[PDB]
Amino acid sequence: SDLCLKFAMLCTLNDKCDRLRKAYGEACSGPHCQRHVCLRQLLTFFEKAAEPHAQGLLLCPCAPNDRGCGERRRNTIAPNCALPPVAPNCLELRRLCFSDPLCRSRLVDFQTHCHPMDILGTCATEQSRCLRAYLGLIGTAMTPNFVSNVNTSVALSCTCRGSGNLQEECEMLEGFFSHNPCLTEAIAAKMRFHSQLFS
Amino acid sequence: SDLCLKFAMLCTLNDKCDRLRKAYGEACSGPHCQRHVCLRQLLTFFEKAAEPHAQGLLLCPCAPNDRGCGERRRNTIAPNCALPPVAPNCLELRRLCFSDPLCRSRLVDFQTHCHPMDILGTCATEQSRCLRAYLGLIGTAMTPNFVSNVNTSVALSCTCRGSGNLQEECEMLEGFFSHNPCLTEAIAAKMRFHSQLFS
Amino acid sequence: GCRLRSQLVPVRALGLGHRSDELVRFRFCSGSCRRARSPHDLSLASLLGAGALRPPPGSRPVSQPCCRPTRYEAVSFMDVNSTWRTVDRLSATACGCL
Amino acid sequence: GCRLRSQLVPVRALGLGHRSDELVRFRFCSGSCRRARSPHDLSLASLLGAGALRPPPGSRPVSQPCCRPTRYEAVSFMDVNSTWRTVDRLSATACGCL
Amino acid sequence: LYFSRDAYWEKLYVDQAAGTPLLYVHALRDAPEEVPSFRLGQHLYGTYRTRLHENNWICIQEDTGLLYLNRSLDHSSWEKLSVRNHGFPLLTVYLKVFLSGECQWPGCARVYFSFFNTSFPACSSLKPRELCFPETRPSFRIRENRPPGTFHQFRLLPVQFLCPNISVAYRLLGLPFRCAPDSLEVSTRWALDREQREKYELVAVCTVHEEVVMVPFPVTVYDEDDSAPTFPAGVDTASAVVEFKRKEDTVVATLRVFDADVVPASGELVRRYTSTLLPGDTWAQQTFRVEHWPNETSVQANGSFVRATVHDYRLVLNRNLSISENRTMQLAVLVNDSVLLLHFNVSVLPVSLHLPSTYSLSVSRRARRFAQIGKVCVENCQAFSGINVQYKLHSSCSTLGVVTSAEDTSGILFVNDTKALRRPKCAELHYMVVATDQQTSRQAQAQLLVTVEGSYVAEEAGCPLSCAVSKRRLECEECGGLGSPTGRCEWRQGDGKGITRNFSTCSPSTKTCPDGHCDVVETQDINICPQDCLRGSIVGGHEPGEPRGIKAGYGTCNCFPEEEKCFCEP
Amino acid sequence: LYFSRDAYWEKLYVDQAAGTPLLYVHALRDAPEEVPSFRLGQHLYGTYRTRLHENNWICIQEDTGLLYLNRSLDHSSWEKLSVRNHGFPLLTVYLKVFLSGECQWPGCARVYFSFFNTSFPACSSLKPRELCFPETRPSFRIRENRPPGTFHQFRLLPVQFLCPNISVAYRLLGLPFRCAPDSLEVSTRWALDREQREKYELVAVCTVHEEVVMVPFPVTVYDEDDSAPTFPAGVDTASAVVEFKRKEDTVVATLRVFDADVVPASGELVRRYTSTLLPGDTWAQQTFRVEHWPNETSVQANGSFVRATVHDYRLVLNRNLSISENRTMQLAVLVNDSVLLLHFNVSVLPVSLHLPSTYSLSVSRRARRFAQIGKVCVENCQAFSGINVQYKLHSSCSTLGVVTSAEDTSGILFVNDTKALRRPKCAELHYMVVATDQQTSRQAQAQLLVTVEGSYVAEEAGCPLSCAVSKRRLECEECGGLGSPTGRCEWRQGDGKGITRNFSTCSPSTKTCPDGHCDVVETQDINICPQDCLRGSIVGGHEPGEPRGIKAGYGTCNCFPEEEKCFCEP
Ligand SMILES: *[C@@H]1O[C@H](CO)[C@@H](O)[C@H](O)[C@H]1NC(C)=O
Ligand SMILES: *[C@@H]1O[C@H](CO)[C@@H](O)[C@H](O)[C@H]1NC(C)=O
Ligand SMILES: *[C@@H]1O[C@H](CO)[C@@H](O)[C@H](O)[C@H]1NC(C)=O
Ligand SMILES: *[C@@H]1O[C@H](CO)[C@@H](O)[C@H](O)[C@H]1NC(C)=O
Ligand SMILES: *[C@@H]1O[C@H](CO)[C@@H](O)[C@H](O)[C@H]1NC(C)=O
Ligand SMILES: *[C@@H]1O[C@H](CO)[C@@H](O)[C@H](O)[C@H]1NC(C)=O
Ligand SMILES: *[C@@H]1O[C@H](CO)[C@@H](O)[C@H](O)[C@H]1NC(C)=O
Ligand SMILES: *[C@@H]1O[C@H](CO)[C@@H](O)[C@H](O)[C@H]1NC(C)=O
Ligand SMILES: *[C@@H]1O[C@H](CO)[C@@H](O)[C@H](O)[C@H]1NC(C)=O
Ligand SMILES: *[C@@H]1O[C@H](CO)[C@@H](O)[C@H](O)[C@H]1NC(C)=O
Ligand SMILES: *[C@@H]1O[C@H](CO)[C@@H](O)[C@H](O)[C@H]1NC(C)=O
Ligand SMILES: *[C@@H]1O[C@H](CO)[C@@H](O)[C@H](O)[C@H]1NC(C)=O
Ligand SMILES: *[C@@H]1O[C@H](CO)[C@@H](O)[C@H](O)[C@H]1NC(C)=O
Ligand SMILES: *[C@@H]1O[C@H](CO)[C@@H](O)[C@H](O)[C@H]1NC(C)=O
Ligand SMILES: [Ca+2]
Ligand SMILES: [Ca+2]
Ligand SMILES: [Ca+2]
Ligand SMILES: [Ca+2]
Ligand SMILES: [Ca+2]
Ligand SMILES: [Ca+2]
Ligand SMILES: [Ca+2]
Ligand SMILES: [Ca+2]
C-alpha cells in the first residue's frame, strides 16, 4: 500500500475530514455526473478543512515507476467530471475565472505568492504561502491537475491552439504552471516533507 | 371440568361463534361497564348464530351441589352489567318492552309458543319452538336469568312491590316465568338432551 | 411469507394475573420479509458474514426487516369468580414487514 | 438503549462487487426497546416462556420491537481503476424502535 | 260492574247437538242499581289474535248470560278453520264478552274454546275429576265496599245435558261466602273490607254419584281509600338544628306517615299524596324543600298480612348556608290524602373560625420541592361540608407554601424552593398562617416558629426525577425523587396474592402517594406521585384507578411519566 | 508604436548617487513617421498593485528614453515604504511607462525595481555573469511588414557608471539582425514576413575584461493578413446526390479552404470569414445551410513550422425531405476574407416503396402474447433516416399485430391474442401486410401465408406472469412468462467477472429482451422484459441502464415488476 493511500486514510480516520471527502465523492461519481455540483463541493473541502489534512491528501509522493500511486493522485480531484471533456482555449478559461469574484480572488493570490522571482527557484514571499494560494485554485474554473502519472508536472487542461495573435499571453499563462521554478520547488519541498513525515 | 364449560368451548372452537362471543364479552366487562352496548351485542349473538351453539351455551346442565357449574351459568349473559342494579316494578319493565318494536316482537312470540296450556306440562304448539321464542328475550329489556345457583328456576329481575292495585296482572306476569309448566318442561327436555349429547 | 396466524391458548398461560379456565384464539405474526430488503441490509448481512464487525455490547443487530403486527384486537373471557375480564390489544389482525 | 453506532469497514468486505482498497465509516443501529412494549409483546413473551405455542414453520416470531434505522446516507470511494464509485443509502444516521 | 274472572274455558267437540248449553257468565255489582247485560263478539280470534271466521255457531241469552251452540260442528268447518290457523294444530280459539280493540277487565272477558277431533264421548270414559270442575282453575276478583252478590255457579252444563243419570252434589266449607241449596250459585253475605283480610282461599266440595273431589278457590279482595293518614302512634314532630354541615342538599329532619291504602298507585301517587309547604319566611323557600317518597310495608290484623303505605317526609336544604346566620323558625307542612299536619323546629347557629395559638413544625434540612410537612386545620376539621376556608401563608426567604386540599378543607403546607432552604441566617422564620373565608370576609391568623433542622448530603447525578421510575428496593433509598420529605425515597412492597390493591413500588411519601387520592400537592407535578396521578396505558394485567392511576396491578408497577406508560409485571 | 518587450527589470541599492543612469527603453515604429515619446508614472506600485508613495526619486529623459535617479535612497525611505507593503519583505516595486488604469501592451510597459538592503558593492564581487546581462532574460516582439528599427541596447548602465575600468564587448552571431560597432544598439535589416520564418532565437556574445558569456535571444515575429484564400491545390468542387438519408441535418458535401493568416482570432473570426450563400431557388434556403468552422494546421516553409488556418465548408440540410422529390441544382457560395468562389452539385432522387411479393412465416401453436415472430421491412431497411413508413395489418380471427419500431423503420409483428390462435378452421389465414407512408400517401401491400403449427401442452398454475421473476435455471424452462414465443422461457447465464454487462437471467426472448433496447413490443407490458424496461431501485451493487433498466449487475439479477425492484446478488 502506497503513500497516497496512507494520506487518504488519515482524512478518512478523521471525523472532520471524511465528512467533507464524502461530500465530493458523491457529487463526482457515475456516468451521469454533474459538473457544477462536483466543483462546489471541492472549494468547501480545500477551504473548510485543516491545512495538514488537505496538503497531504492532494500533494503526495510516489516513485516514477510506481504506477498505482500516481494514477490515483491524478484522479483525486475527480478529473473525468471536474475537468471539461473538450479542452478550451487557455485564454478563454481565464475569462470565466475573471467573471466570478471567487476565482478572481483565488487566482490573484496565486499570481501574488508564487510568482517566478528567480530562475533558480526562489519564491517571492514564502514557500509556505505558495501552496495556500495554489490549493485555492482546485475547485475553481481553472482547476490544475497532474498531467501524467509518472511525474509531478502539473498544468491546466487547456490549449493555445486557437489563440490568434495572443500566443505569448497564452504561452506565459501556461508557463506559469509548467515552467514555474517557485511552484515546482514549493511542491517539491512539500513532497520531501511528506516522505519524511510518515514514510 | 363441568358441562357449562364444555359447551362454552364448543362455541370457542367454532370460528362463527367465538367471533360473536368475543363481541359481548368485551362490551360487558369491568366496573365502568355500559349497559346499552352490552345488551345490543347479546341480540346479535342469540340471533345470528346457529341454534345448537346458542342453546348449548345458555341452557346447560349441572348438579344441585355442583356450585361452579350453576354459578357460571347465572353469569353467562353478564347480569352485573346487563341486569339493572335496582329492581324496578315488574309492570314497568313490560312498558319499556312494549315501547320498542323489537322486544314486542320477541315477547309476543313467547306469549304465543310457551303459554301454559295444561298444568301437567303440555305446551301449545311445540316444545321445540318454545326455546326459540324464549332465547329471543335475552338481549331485550325483559332479560330473564337464573335466580339461584343450585336449581334451574328462572325469573325476571323485577318485583311487584309498588304495584298499586294491579297485583294479579303482575303476579301472573311473573308466574309466566316461575310457574310455567310448559317452559319448565321445555328447558328440562333440553337439559336432558344436553346430558345425553356430550356427557 | 409475512402473514397472519391463529392458535388456541389458556388464559392462565398468558402471564397477566388473570386466573381462569378457558381457551382463547390468539393471532400472531410470522414469516420472512426478503422483498422489503435495503442496500444496508445486504451490507450488514455480509459484514456479519465474514465477521467484519465487532458486535456491540448488548444485542445482535438484525439484518432483515422484522415481521410485526399492524393492528390488534381485544380478548374477553370469564375468571374463576365468573366475572367478565377483558384485556385490550392482545391478538393481532394483520401483519406487515417493518 | 436503541442508539446510533459507527465503525470502519473495507469496501471489498461489503459484498457488492466493488473491488477497492479503502476504508469507510459505517453507521448501524443497535440496542433494546423495552419502553415501546405492548400488551401483545408481554403476551407473546410469556406464551414463548412455557412453550405454549407451536412455533410456525419458517422463522421465530420476535417479541420486542426491533431496533431499526430511520434514515440513510450515501457512501463514496475510489475503485481499483481510480474511479469514484458511490453506493446510495449504505450507512444509517438515526435509529428508532419499530 | 265487573266480571268475577277474566278468562273462561270451554271444550267443543265434533257433531254436538244444537242448543247445547256451554257455560254461564257472572258479573257483580258496584251499586244497588246495575243489572248486567251480555253481548258476544262476532269473530273467533285465534293464536296470535287474528280473526278466523265469523261466529255462525254460538249464540247467547242475555238474561242469565248463557252461551249455547246454535249451529253445530263438522270436520268441514274444522278444516275450514285449521287452514286459516297459519299452520298450527288448533286447540284454542276465543271470543270477547263485553258488558259495558283489545279485551281488558273490567270491561271485557275473553272466553276460550279448546276444540278436539273426537265427538263428545260416552259417560263411562268420564272420570269424576273432569266431572266436577274444569281443568283451568278460576281466580276470583272482588272489590271491597260493595253490594253482596253472586259470582260463581258450579255445574258443567254439557255434562249434565249429555250424562244426566249421575247425581253430583256441591257445597262449601263465620265466612261471608255461602252456597245456596238446590241452586248452586255462590254468594257473599256481607260487604268485605280488605284491611281485615285480603285473601280468601276456600275449598269447594264436589261429590259424584262415588268420589269426593275438592279444588282450591282463590278470592282476592281489592281496595279503596277507606283510610286517612295517621302519625305512627304519637310521634308528632321531629326537629334538627343546623350547626356544621350547611351543604347544598342534606337530610336534616324526618317524620313518617302511615296510610293504610294501596290504591294511589305508582303512576298517580304524585298527584294525590302531595306535601303542601305551609308558608313563612322566604328564607325557608330559599333554604328548604320537603322531599317525600313512599314505600310499602306489611302489618298483621287478624292472622293475615295486610299491606300499607309509609310516607316519609324529609327536610332537605337547597344552598350553601353562610357561616354567620343565627335564626330559628317553625316549618309547618300540610299533607294531603285524596289531611295531616306536620312541623319542624329549625335553628341555625353561628360558627367561629378560631385556630390554635402556636403552630410548631420541624423541617428536614435536605428536603425537596412539594414535600408535605404538616397539616394546618381550622379547629373542627372534618365536620364542615360547605365552607371554603382557603389558607394563605404571609411572612414577616420564601421556602414554604400552603394550598388547601378541598376534600377536608385543611391546608397542607409544602416546600416550594430548595435553594432558599439551606441559608444560614434564615434558619428560623415567621410564617403567619392565615385562614380566610370566601362567602364571608372573616379570616384568621396564627403564629408559627419553624426550625429547619438536619444534616446535609448532596445527591447523586444518576437520579431520575421521580422515585417511581425505580424498579427494586436498593434503587429506591439511594436515589432521590421529587416530592421527598428527607431527600431519600422509601420502598413499599406488598404480597404475592395476584392482582392486589396492596402492591409494590418506590414512593416518596408512603402515606400520601400510593393512597388512592391524587392530592393537590401530588398533582402539582408529573413526577411526584405518577402511579396515582397518571393518564396513560398500563401494559400488563392491571385494573385501573377509577378517576385515574393504578388501582391494582399484577406484581410490581414501574411508571415512566415522561412517556406516559406503566408496566405491571413481577 | 510598440515596445520591444513588456516587462523591464532593474536593481536599486542603498545610497547610490544622484543622476545615476538606470536603463534605456525601446520602441519600434509602425510607420515611417512615428517618433517615441516617453513619460513615467507618478506612484510606485507594489505587490498586489497598490500605490506606496509618490515617485520623488526617479526621473526620465524623453529623448533617448533614459531612467535615472534624481533624488537618492536611504534606510528611512525603505522603512517608509516597507511598512506600507502590507507586511512583506520588499523585493519588487514598479512603475508604468506609457508612450501613447492597468498596464497592457502595446500602450504600456511596466518597469520593475528590486531593491536590496546593501549598498552597491565593489567591483571585485561582480562575477562576469551579472556583468553582461540581467537575470530575467528579455523576450522580444516584432510585428511583420514594418519599417526596420532599433529594439535593444546592451550595456548595464550603473555597472559602467560605477565600474568603468573593465572593458566589455558585445556582438551578434543572412540574418536580418545586426549589431553596430561602437554603438551597441541592435537593429533589423529588412522588413520581416512571418510566413517564411516566425521565431528567431539568436545568441548574443558578451566578453568581459576574461570570460565569454552567451545568453538566449528570442524574437517572435507577429502577423498580418498578407494572404488570400486558396483551394487546396486544385480541388474546386465536390458534389453529392441526396438518395436515402433525408434527415433534418446531415453533412452532404464538403470542401476546404487554406488561408495562411492567423490574425482573425477566435473572438472575431465570425465577423470576417463569412460564408455568403449565393442565391438560387428558395428550396435551397428551405433545405440547405452552409456550415463552417475553422481549425489551425501547421506547414513547413524553409525548415521551420509556420501555422495556418483551414476553413471547412459543409452542406447541411434543414428539414425532412419527402420521398417524391426529383431535382438538381448548382449551389454556389462566395467566401469572404477580410474572396473565393465555391459550388456544389446537388441532385435529389425519387425512391420507390416496394416490398417482397410473398411473406412466409410459421407460428408456434402454443405461443403467448407479444411474442416476436418475424420482421417485416421495406426493401432497403437500415439506410433510411427520416421516413415514417408505418405498417398496418389488414386481413381478408384476429391473432397477429404489427407495430413498427421507430429506430429501424421496420415493422415487428406480434401475437395479440392466445384464445384466437388454437382455432381449427383458422389454421391458415391471410394477412395483407400494408406499409403506409406519412409525409406522402404512397402505401404498399404484400401477401402472407401463415401456418400456425405445433404441439399443445397446457401450462402450470404456479407460474408468475414474467420469466424474469425466476431465480435459477430449472425454474426458467418449466414455467412460462408473458412474451414467450414457444410457451417456455430460456435461461441465459454469463461469467463470474464481477459487475459485467453479460450477466444471468431468465428471459423469454434471449435475443430481444436482455439486449440494451427496451423495444416497443418489450415496453408493451411491465412483465415481458422487466430487466431492461423498469423504472425502479436495484438493490445491490449495480450500474444502471442509461435510459432505464439494468446495464450491469453483480451476479444474478431477479426483478419484481409489480413491486418495482430488482435484486442483484450472486
Ligand atoms: C512529465 O511527464 C510528461 C508526460 O509524461 C512530460 O510531458 C513532461 O515533460 C515531464 N516533466 C518533465 C520535467 O520532464
Ligand atoms: C330454586 O331455588 C330458589 C332459591 O334457591 C327457590 O326460591 C326456588 O323455590 C327453587 N325452585 C324450586 C322449584 O323449589
Ligand atoms: C239460530 O238458529 C235459528 C234456527 O235454528 C235461526 O233462525 C236464528 O237466526 C239463529 N240465530 C243466530 C243469531 O244465528
Ligand atoms: C287535596 O285535597 C283536597 C280536598 O278535597 C282536594 O280538593 C285537592 O284537589 C287535593 N290536592 C291534590 C294535589 O291532591
Ligand atoms: C322499602 O322497604 C323495604 C323493607 O322495609 C326495603 O327493603 C326497601 O329497600 C325500601 N325501599 C326504599 C326505596 O328504601
Ligand atoms: C355548595 O358547595 C359545593 C362545594 O363544592 C359546590 O359544589 C356547590 O355548587 C355549592 N352549591 C351552590 C348552590 O352553589
Ligand atoms: C318546637 O318549638 C316550639 C316553640 O316554642 C316548642 O313549643 C316545642 O316544644 C318545640 N318542639 C320540641 C319537640 O321541643
Ligand atoms: C411557588 O408556587 C407558586 C404556586 O402558585 C408558583 O407560582 C411559584 O412559581 C413557585 N415558586 C417558584 C420559585 O417557582
Ligand atoms: C530633480 O532634482 C533637481 C535638483 O537636483 C530639482 O531641481 C528638480 O526639480 C528635480 N526634478 C524632479 C522631476 O523631481
Ligand atoms: C466582405 O469583404 C468586403 C470587401 O471589402 C467588405 O466590404 C465586407 O464588409 C466584408 N463582409 C464581411 C461580413 O466581412
Ligand atoms: C483540429 O485539427 C487537429 C489536428 O489536425 C485535431 O486534433 C483537432 O481535433 C481538430 N479540431 C476539430 C474541432 O476538429
Ligand atoms: C425529421 O424527422 C425526425 C425523426 O424523429 C424528427 O425527430 C424531426 O423533428 C424531423 N424534422 C422536422 C424539421 O420536423
Ligand atoms: C456539376 O454540374 C455541372 C453542370 O453541367 C457540370 O458541368 C459539372 O461537371 C458538374 N460537376 C462535376 C464535378 O462533375
Ligand atoms: C391488440 O392490441 C391493440 C393495440 O392497439 C389493443 O388496442 C387491443 O386491445 C389488443 N387486443 C385485445 C383483444 O386486447
Ligand atoms: Ca277498605
Ligand atoms: Ca289514604
Ligand atoms: Ca284501603
Ligand atoms: Ca397519593
Ligand atoms: Ca505576413
Ligand atoms: Ca486571410
Ligand atoms: Ca499572415
Ligand atoms: Ca430487450
Author numbering:
A (entry chain C), B (entry chain D): 159 to 357
C (entry chain B), D (entry chain A): 122 to 219
E (entry chain F), F (entry chain E): 29 to 128, 135 to 207, 211 to 246, 251 to 379, 388 to 445, 449 to 622
What does the paper say about this structure?
Signaling through RET plays essential regulatory roles in the development of the nervous system and kidney. Glia cell line-derived growth factor (GDNF), Neurturin (NRTN), Artemin (ARTN) and Persephin are four ligands that induce dimerization of RET through assembling 2:2:2 ternary complexes with RET and the co-receptors GDNF receptor-α family proteins (GFRα1–4). Here, we report the cryo-EM structures of four extracellular 2:2:2 ligand/co-receptor/RET complexes, including GDF15/GFRAL/RET, GDNF/GFRα1/RET, NRTN/GFRα2/RET and ARTN/GFRα3/RET, at near-atomic resolution. The structures show that the extracellular region of RET adopts a ‘C-clamp’ shape, which is stabilized by extensive inter-domain interactions as well as binding of calcium ion at multiple sites.
The same procedure was used for the structure determination of the 2:2:2 NRTN/GFRα2/RET and ARTN/GFRα3/RET complexes, leading to reconstructions to 3.4 Å and 3.5 Å resolution, respectively. The segments in GFRα1, GFRα2 and GFRα3 corresponding to the helix-loop-helix-loop motif in GFRAL are much shorter and adopt extended loop conformations. As a result, interfaces I in GFRα1/RET, GFRα2/RET and GFRα3/RET are much smaller (buried surface areas less than 700 Å2) and likely weaker than that in GFRAL/RET (buried surface area ~ 1500 Å2). Interfaces II of GFRα1, GFRα2 and GFRα3 with RET (buried surface areas ~ 730–1010 Å2) however are more extensive than that in GFRAL/RET (buried surface areas ~ 680 Å2), which may partially compensate for their weaker interfaces I. The D1 domain of the co-receptors is invisible in the 3D reconstructions of GDF15/GFRAL/RET, GDNF/GFRα1/RET, and ARTN/GFRα3/RET, suggesting that it is not involved in the binding to either RET or the ligands in these three complexes. However, there are large differences in the angle between the two wings of the batwing-shaped complexes, which mainly originate from the different conformations of the ligand dimers and their different interfaces with the co-receptors. This angle in the GDF15/GFRAL/RET complex (~60°) is much more acute than that in the complexes of GDNF/GFRα1/RET (130°), NRTN/GFRα2/RET (105°) and ARTN/GFRα3/RET (108°). Surprisingly, some 2D class averages of the NRTN/GFRα2/RET and ARTN/GFRα3/RET complexes appear to be larger than the 2:2:2 complexes. We performed the same image processing procedure for the dataset of the ARTN/GFRα3/RET complex, but the 3D reconstruction failed due to inadequate number of particles.
